[model samples]
Target chain A: GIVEQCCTSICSLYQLENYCN
Target chain B: FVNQHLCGSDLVEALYLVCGERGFFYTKPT
Candidate 1:
């Protein structure tokens, strides 16, 4: 849950779709 | 990985920002 939140925010910050997956 | 480097590089400060101090250790997200 924590990692998800961070990844989502980071993805949005960098505009990288599915980047965290 | 590349993203970890990103998190380690310019995003270092933000590492603390998003995840706080303790959780920031996982800049590699693993």
Candidate 2:
């Protein structure tokens, strides 16, 4: 889903490991 | 690969790509 990808992408982009599942 | 920190407009462009024009909007009322 785009939402999931968006969230993951943001997490990845920011390096916010905690934000990822 | 991984990034050590946020750089340039990477984040902005990424969101713009995924969310399009609606991705950017000021929420705080003037």
Candidate 3:
């Protein structure tokens, strides 16, 4: 599902701590 | 509940981030 993949990609991208801070 | 929802909500945060997908669909961004 595109939604799932998109969700996963975004999650991985943001899992970087600097992304949150 | 509030703090938990905010913290345990990484998936939701990802959704929010992609909703801001700038290239193809800008409709999702905040």
Q: Give DockQ for candidates 1 onward, in order.
A: 0.10, 0.11, 0.10
> For model 1, what is the alpha-carbon lDDT of residue A16?
26
Clash pairs for candidate 1: none
- Residues B1-30, candidate 1: write the lDDT tens digits: 234323334454445444443444434545
Could you list the iRMS of every candidate? 9.7, 8.9, 9.6
How close is each model in CA RMSD to the real structure?
Answer: 9.5, 9.4, 8.9
In Å, residue A12's CA in model 2 sits off its true spot by 5.6
Q: Candidate 2, residue B18: CA error in Å?
A: 1.0
Docking class of 1: incorrect
Cα shift from native, residue B3, model 2 (Å): 9.2
Model 2 lDDT tens row, B1-30? 343233235444444443454443212122
Which candidate number maximizes TM-score? Answer: 2
Q: After superposition, how far is residue A20 of candidate 3 from its true place, in Å?
A: 20
Query: Quality of candidate 3's docking, in CAPRI categories?
Result: incorrect
lDDT (0-100) at residue A3 of candidate 2? 32
Cα lDDT tens digits for candidate 2, A1-21: 323434443345333322222
> TM-scores, in order shown?
0.27, 0.32, 0.24
Q: What lDDT is obtained when candidate 1 is compared to the true structure? A: 0.40
